[PDB]
Backbone:
RNA sequence: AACGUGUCGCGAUGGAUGACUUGGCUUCCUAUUUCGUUGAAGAACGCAGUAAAGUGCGAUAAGUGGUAUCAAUUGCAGAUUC
RNA sequence: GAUGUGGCCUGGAGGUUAGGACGAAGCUUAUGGCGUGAGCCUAAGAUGGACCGGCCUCUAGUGCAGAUCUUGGUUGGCGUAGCAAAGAUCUAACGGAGAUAUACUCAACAUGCAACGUUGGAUACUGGAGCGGGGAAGGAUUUCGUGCCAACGGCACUCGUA
RNA sequence: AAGUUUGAAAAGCACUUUGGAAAGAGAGUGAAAUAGAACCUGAAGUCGUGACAAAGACAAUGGAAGUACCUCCAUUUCAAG
């Protein structure tokens, strides 16, 4: 029977954690990520989901070097 | 300073510590005003003040703390009691008091010298 | 009071099921005081657990 | 220009005992299955939205 | 602050309990029956209900409950014996008696004068139904307030 | 009789309205204004005397150095130009 | 279906004229008065605690009973339907606030019920394709000891994978 | 989903008494506790309680015209009127 009983027949897992992006979207059998396309050099980006683009773009994380370089540029690379 | 109420209130309530110091100033007495030609000074620990508005007006004391996160000063003679019986100090906004005796240091003297109106 | 811990430790020490461990119903105060395998072994030696 | 329309909402159709307004997709939240896009829905788009022209 | 005030405050005792985890409908019937009673009579009645020699008459929330002979003394044919509500009301009566003693009044003269039961805020659980449905399973607790006065012989 | 009905006084449940606004939306302007193999954006794990999240930071880790200020920080502890 | 109205009402702007801690907005009503009406105004609050009314112009996201309308909250049915597969518990002592809990009168019954953990004893069940003992997948502290009993374990708890 | 909007200030209820506890009854702070911690205001709907009016089965509601009883409402009159 295709409903409740068959729910108990689902055993393995299709996806595991991705090294590059951290989502549970790394397809184990085809060794590639459904979310970020790792290990292809560039990442997944599609204009039919601007919402997904805005979830992933620059500034959603830390910007730990960009803040520094922005300040240096604003101060004209001042040095003693 | 700002033709925008939203921006002015945001700046006031998010001011840093060294800006809160200046925002928490109190007028000097008439004698001190005449001696120094300065109208007001930021309040400092160990100065002497007299309360001018509120329930405790007329009381005198010495400043024990400028809390600066609650926007108040604490005076040693201004206090009350809890239900337990132990006493607690009561906070007063610094614009409601008058300074009667400054705590003098070399740098405070320099500050008064640069604020002199002569 | 509960002597569950002493019964479990005595089962482990004597190597039998719980149905074969006998705890004396008049020495509950003494059995309450044993918290280690060493103390329970002393109880077995003294005969409050057989 | 985007306000009130940032959902992938679809009508459930007839044959269920609910009004035919479009509804939010998904599950696991209190907004799932709620009414959407209409000027009479909470969180929907206003009637004749205003413009700068 | 109670919904009524005693005539003479100095000769009265009060008691109250909030968000009590007993069924509102059972406690309504259990508490309303002692309203005009002397305190010792009310306590005797509660003891006899626990012993099942007398019953509590159910007058409002009684749709399709059983019929009994012990309801005849109240002019009814329906009544029950709710022990969970009875023990809580016994506790409340003991508290009111202690308050009267501390004020310096004689408990063998007190007469209950005000009783009021109200629905409190509900708590939520859930139950599972056929074809994958989930449906509410709620609890209905109550507030109780009362006061008693000294009768003047 | 009881149950029920109606009106007024007082209580409960419920969270509307008013007043409030460090938020949003929209328009306009000024610049020695535009990241990365000299390893970016993103992702992970850590760091406080007390510290889950958040914020800041990287084994020099709720910060080192310099300049300017001038007496705090603060829930509790701890300790003038330092 | 057309049209008129020194016709009524709501948010904001330009003017003008007023009110308010001796109490603004909001809210309540067997509070009357005015108007054919939409509505307006006064009274009382044993309500509230800081803003706001009239008039002339300007402007609009400007008036609800119903759309199997949207979102939040209530409600009769209702102490109702039910909580019936896997056979089943009994007894004493100890533990616990969970008792042997009383106004006159009254020896005790007829006025404190119901229910619980541990140990001993009795009686049954699983019946080696096991409510036995170990592993993979999946889960990730659920494991151990001491406490605790608000919520959760669709009855209960002094007990618990809480 | 969700304003943390108690109060000027925690002054966030010492102490006594009943209870296993949660709490209750007193006492106290505050201008105010019907401001007691998710705490300004606190509507509608629904419910409890006290007092009162009655009332057959005529479903209830509704129109018109009177009367019995009530009325924290308004207005007008009291002596030459
Ligand atoms: K039944
Ligand atoms: Mg398969
Ligand atoms: Mg596969
Ligand atoms: Mg919107
Ligand atoms: Mg039946
Ligand atoms: Mg079911
Ligand atoms: Mg299912
Ligand atoms: Mg509002
Ligand atoms: Mg570029
Ligand atoms: Mg942390
Ligand atoms: Mg290093
Ligand atoms: Mg509209
Ligand atoms: Mg409406
Ligand atoms: Mg059954
Ligand atoms: Mg069975
Ligand atoms: Mg057998
Ligand atoms: Mg249960
Ligand atoms: Mg309130
Ligand atoms: Na508008
Ligand atoms: Zn990836």
Residues:
């Amino acid at each position: 029977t295709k409903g409740t009983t068959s729910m108990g027949q689902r055993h393995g897992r299709t996806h595991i954690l991705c090294r590059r992006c951290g989502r549970n979207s790394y397809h184990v059998q085809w060794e590639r990520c459904a979310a970020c396309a790792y290990p292809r050099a560039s990442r997944r980006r599609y204009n039919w989901s601007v919402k997904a683009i805005k979830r992933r773009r620059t500034g959603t994380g830390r910007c730990r070097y960009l803040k520094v370089v922005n300040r240096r540029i604003a101060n004209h690379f001042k040095t003693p | 300073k700002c033709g925008s109420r939203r921006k002015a209130r945001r700046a006031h309530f998010q001011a840093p510590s060294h800006v809160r110091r200046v925002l928490m100033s109190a007028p000097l007495s008439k004698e001190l005003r005449a001696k120094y030609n300065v109208r007001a000074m930021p309040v400092r620990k160990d100065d002497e003040v007299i309360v001018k508005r509120g329930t405790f007006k007329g009381r005198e004391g010495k400043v024990t703390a400028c809390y600066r996160l609650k926007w108040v000063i604490l005076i040693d003679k201004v206090n009350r009691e809890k239900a337990n019986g132990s006493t607690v100090a009561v906070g007063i906004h610094p614009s409601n008091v008058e300074i009667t005796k400054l705590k003098l240091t070399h740098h405070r003297k320099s500050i008064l010298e640069r604020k002199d109106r002569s | 009071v509960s002597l569950k811990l002493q019964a479990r430790l005595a089962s482990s020490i004597l190597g039998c099921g719980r149905a074969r461990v006998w705890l004396d119903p008049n020495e509950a105060v003494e059995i309450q005081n044993a918290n280690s395998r060493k103390s329970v072994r002393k109880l077995i030696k003294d005969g409050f657990i057989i | 220009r985007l306000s009130g329309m940032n959902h992938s909402a679809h009508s459930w159709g007839t044959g269920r005992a609910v009004a035919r307004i479009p509804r939010i997709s998904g599950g696991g939240t209190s907004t799932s299955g709620a009414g959407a896009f209409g000027n009479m829905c909470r969180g929907g788009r206003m009637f004749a939205p205003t413009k700068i022209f | 602050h109670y919904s009524r005030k005693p005539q003479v405050s100095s000769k009265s005792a009060k008691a109250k309990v909030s968000d009590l985890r007993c069924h509102y409908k059972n406690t309504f019937e259990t508490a309303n029956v002692i309203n005009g009673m002397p305190l010792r009579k009310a306590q005797q009645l509660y003891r006899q209900v626990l012993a099942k020699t007398r019953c509590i008459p159910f007058k409002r929330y009684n749709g399709k409950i059983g019929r009994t002979a012990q309801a005849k003394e109240w002019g009814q044919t329906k009544g029950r014996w709710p022990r969970k509500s009875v023990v809580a009301m016994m506790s409340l009566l003991k508290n009111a008696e202690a308050n009267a003693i501390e004020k310096g009044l004689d408990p063998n003269q007190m007469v209950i004068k005000h009783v009021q039961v109200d629905q409190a805020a509900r708590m939520r659980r859930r139950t599972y139904r056929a074809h994958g449905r989930i449906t509410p399973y709620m609890c209905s607790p109550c507030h109780v307030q009362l006061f008693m006065s000294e009768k003047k012989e």
